[PDB]
Symmetry: D2
Subunit: 417 residues, 4 copies
């Protein structure tokens, strides 16, 4: 909680509290609500399925929604290699499964993940994460044979560094463990967020990603991606990895928006990799639930038929220009990062020092809340802008104007915590 709000109902990008007050949702429940709240087609799909079968573990009997969803997810995944899908409940358990699939297929034990990453809260995925110290404190020891590498930062760079220089420097950092203590032939996979979500909406440069991808292929390391936050149209392409040229992951984790916030996740992977493990050795009883699966079928169709991928791209381009214009009048805005309706607005004390301004960031979100918009922060000083992709233009403009007013009010000293 940030402000003790109790939601009674919601539709599209609008939240209504128990009292009747209205809010514009710029969070979409951490990008679980790409399709907007209570989308008519998803509600109906949930209702109709519940009438027939609430649950049977698909490992004992197939159900139609699970069969249909498994085929479809295999189709829409990036690349042309034959795919298989394994269902879970959460992004967390999907990233735990990624570790399992990679170890079992390769016969290798080490996993490489990123500082700044967030992969979930189960013991495997929580070890991979590098987003929060409180995810390691008191609960160790963690999963063995996990190595963290730094994710490329395009904002706080060295003087005179180009995109090319940053890519090379961070790739050299990527190689350092492999040239010292970490055998590449013993690394099962690299797990990467094509754009880091919780880390602050940070996109790896094209050249950096191509270097890692090639490194993996050349050493027989699996290239895995986490699309749990950045997938299903969020970046203005179906998959965040499609922001890069011709990269097909060996394993991909999908969650959050998948079933409009119903607990469903998937690992989608190359056929051969996915066949190294199955039920009943790896299984979640309520995973691939038929009600959740019907919910997902409807939400996937909504993304396609309402053109939400295209809308995220064009609205994202627009929101990027609006925030850039705001940056010209508000020097507290240090960096505008936007790929689709998917933004990190980084607030700094000074543009030259780039020193984080967590105080100002919290004031903005407090102002916004008092003026009917829900927005939160990342890593202290970064506003996350991830509204449902269905957000009508009038509501988007309304929210942007509140944010512009927030910046002015924080400048004048008119906001207190």
């Amino acid at each position: 909680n940030y402000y003790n709000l109790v939601i009674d109902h919601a539709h599209g990008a609008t939240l209504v509290d128990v009292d009747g007050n209205k809010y514009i949702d710029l969070l979409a429940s951490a990008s679980a609500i790409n399709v907007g709240h209570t989308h008519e087609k998803v509600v109906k799909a949930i209702a109709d399925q519940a009438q027939k079968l609430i649950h049977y573990t698909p490992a004992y009997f197939h159900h139609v929604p699970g069969m249909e969803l498994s085929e479809k997810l295999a189709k829409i995944a990036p690349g042309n290699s034959p795919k298989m899908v394994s269902f879970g409940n959460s992004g967390s358990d999907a990233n735990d499964a990624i570790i399992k699939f990679a170890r079992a297929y390769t016969g290798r034990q080490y996993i490489v993940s990123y500082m700044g990453s967030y992969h979930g809260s189960t013991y495997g995925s929580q070890t991979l994460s590098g987003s929060s110290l409180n995810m390691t404190r008191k609960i160790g020891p963690m999963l063995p044979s996990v190595v963290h590498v730094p994710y490329p930062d395009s904002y706080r760079t060295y003087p005179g560094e180009t995109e090319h220089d940053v890519s090379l420097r961070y790739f050299n950092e990527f190689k350092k463990p492999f040239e010292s203590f970490l055998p590449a032939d013993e690394t099962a996979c690299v797990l990467i967020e094509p754009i880091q979500g919780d880390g602050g909406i940070i996109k790896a440069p094209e050249e950096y990603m191509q270097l890692v991808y090639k490194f993996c292929h050349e050493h027989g390391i699996l290239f895995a991606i986490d699309e749990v936050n950045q997938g299903l149209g969020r970046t203005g392409k179906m998959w965040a990895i499609q922001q890069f040229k011709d990269i097909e992951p060996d394993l991909m984790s999908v969650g959050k928006s998948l079933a409009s916030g119903m607990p469903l996740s998937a690992v989608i992977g190359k056929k051969e990799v996915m066949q190294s493990l199955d039920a009943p050795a790896h299984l979640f009883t309520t995973a691939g639930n038929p009600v959740c699966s019907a919910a997902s079928l409807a939400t996937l169709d909504v993304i396609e038929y309402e053109g939400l991928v295209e809308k995220s791209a064009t609205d994202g381009a627009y929101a990027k220009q609006r925030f850039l214009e705001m940056q010209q009048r508000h020097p507290m805005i240090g960096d505008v990062r936007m790929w689709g309706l998917n933004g990190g607005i980084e607030l700094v004390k000074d543009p030259k020092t780039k020193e984080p301004d967590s105080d100002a960031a919290t004031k903005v979100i407090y102002y916004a809340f008092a003026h009917g918009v829900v927005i939160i922060t990342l890593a202290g000083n970064i506003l996350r802008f991830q509204p449902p992709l269905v957000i009508p233009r009038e509501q988007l403009d309304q929210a942007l104007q509140v944010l512009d007013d927030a910046f002015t009010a924080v400048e004048n000293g008119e906001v207190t915590i």
Copy 2:
């Protein structure tokens, strides 16, 4: 897939495939269906909630169903100490949370669990597990600082051993790591299933359980229980741990039946233990989902209103009697174990050698399936008996008669694989 069969719809304890064939459910989807399939109150709760709010992450904003469920679960948990509740999506993640809370509260690392145990498929919970069925081939290394001890087997005992002798022998095995390499003062937690589900419906004797509970208290080791399979009325008490005298767990995992097979789980623990961690330390985006929460509220209401606990105790004792009578005519039944509607029928080659007859158990399964009843085996030779608690007596008797006929056909060599 176990049955290679597509389920179309289901109600109560009757399953209907895509060709209209009817089946009596003696599996209840691994005891996730205590309240029976598509219960009228649960379907309505799901459909009504979906219309208002499909999802918002409870870590940002509260919703009424989640808050009400949190209160109700704290109230119905065993013991009189004030509890806190932490939601997840799966039993697996609830067991991961137990490791976290125990380690955080005690400041110790080691977790003790049992051989034969099943706790889930994430990296924490699957380390704790000890069923041959869900073993960790190809996926290691697992979570460090986990020791397995043997679970008391009251069937294959040494000649002349009483329940007293069994309790003492197994408690002596329990103490052996603590008297060698495992420091009691560095063990955070002992986690036990009060009755082992996947292990074969095996109940720890009263005296063994008291000895462990006391050992934990004397050394400041938390005593945790897994009620994911055996909870919510399955044993003919609300919780399996209530089959024992005056035992309040520090930590308890709950799942499967909690929300009628909708993905929801909980860790319910003593207030002090639960306060040792933050969250972000333990959070899932879709955990405590309002549709799932409303479904759970309704299944809990059904357990109360239809007196399902008492019905489980009553039908359980009936089913025990019935199988005991069958045992008198079919010496292939080596052991009848039953606490509530919750039975392990163990098949053997000879009454004295107690050699497992996995082939005979396979043949019973086939016969039952060919005759309209769904039942599975555990450990090859144990028939597991876990119908929905709502199973009408008429249907229970039908299933029981099919089982009787299966034993007859198997004796006479009339079933072929």
Copy 3:
């Protein structure tokens, strides 16, 4: 410090402090002094080699003592298979090397060792150990993928158990992990002390050892032995494993007496196992030191020339009968375990309860010390009897008389701590 006493010099089985006081050594510095203190032939070997070459790391240049010892150790190892040897500095690092060799050769992770065992003090060997709890306390997490099983106890048995029943019970416990959570095809080796040293001079029954050995052969698990305490003639055979019928280990650790207490250890293993790893990957700078190697060549020569294996066998049988006769007069002696000049004298409060009497044990060692004999306890209540193998009969009889007097004085309450 155990005795709080400065040794000036020593020879054979006699120790001399800085005051001139003489002691009979029944410890032989934890069996590192099989050949007796300052043996003339060993002293000469040390001095002559120190004038030629104190050290060069044999991984850069070979030296003649190292090459000769390497061939000698390959030849005297139990069995007929071609062997190779790898040198270390301590028993501990030899056991660390066993883990390495087994994991490297098999491509598997898990190591099985015994409760009650002692393998050393480095992170690998100390994880495998299971005697002192202090050895795990405060220093975790330890090496992952290690499982401890119980070592067969022939003294505190169930009423009416034969040696056959003991072997079968303990072999059943051995198998329990493999039938639950531990995959046999993922375990690299079993490390076993053929007689447990620090465990209390406990010998696995023949039948037990055969069952484990066969289990290992059948599953491709390496069968590894620790001969650091019990090797080099201590049991009245060259190797403790030779007390068993036709067992050739895949790997064997040797230390302590190898170089008369100079730091030198070895792993002796089958050729194909030993070639799975080499220097410079696995290497200790001062391992295979030419002075230590010359000392070792000399001590091995003494064992042969003075017939110390047979002398241990015949003096050990004599000493066993002496302790058996003491036992008749002194009921505090519950168990006499003795194989060669290698004994555990177990002290108990009552012969039927077998309750440990640590108090009587420490009083015996106090009396012995005040009367010119050095002897210590294991596990509180067991007198450890391991004199140098060269101990003259007159001196052995002298020490045995003091112990008889000690037992009489402890009975009469004449000893105050």
Copy 4:
């Protein structure tokens, strides 16, 4: 075996093989032989002790050389805080002990060590290591809760980077894991080579070292140093850490040259840190061997009496000039690093690209060997220069001229393997 030749005898910096061929030693058995081969004072100390007492485990009885050495090591260790010493056999076990002392004193789990480091071949010290030459292939999983950070590289730097810029960039890398997944408050220790030996004779800049030292003190992390290769006058100070301003380590490992290559090591630590662990919990049987202890007393004496600290400083400054002069005529020499008689001469394909030239390096080694000098490489392309500190000027000049001719011959293409 590196050279395929058998050493028969050696004295000072000259080695003689079995055929009578003389070699000048620029390896000194990886810096185990600081005081020169078979030094008269050390040979005599070995022989004289061997006559009195070859061994007794000093945990049972004190011996005089062990007592004197313990006092002398506590005295000559850097800084003015009271120290305690714990003996081992090898640098590997001393570094394993460092982990143990740090975890036990702090009650924290995590250990930070460096890429490019070498700390030994036991499971603890080998996990900490980061030398490609000592990779842990096939032997995992390793010790849990170990994080590697990059060591400052002052040769392959970014354009226009100063020593200051290097110190700040590498300190920024040091902090990255602490700002992502590694809690400072849960890390027990940072272990650092003041100059990395096996890493290629790489010295951390003063400013970097002060930053790490300060960070450790401010977070309650123990600051540990490894002086096994770089201690005992090798750098031209007694300890390599004395190359830096006012740094007193909490823990220091010492070995290799400590007893002229006899197996002996020590952890020297602040008194309150060392008291956290005891014996018999932590103990090696043959550690602090009296013959080894006597050898060490004599080598320490030679270091003082022959003024070898000063000799290394002035011969090293001389050797740096000679190699710098060679660099002028031989552009294949990319970098000359030298602190005492202790150098890394790095060979490259081109002065601007700095591409490593391993082929040129192995050819130089081969030529040198063919003309009577012993020298090896590190990291493929770095000539390592560590002769005994006693090397007479005439012999040094002789060896330096052979190296000069080697560069000439490789340049002209006259060397083939």
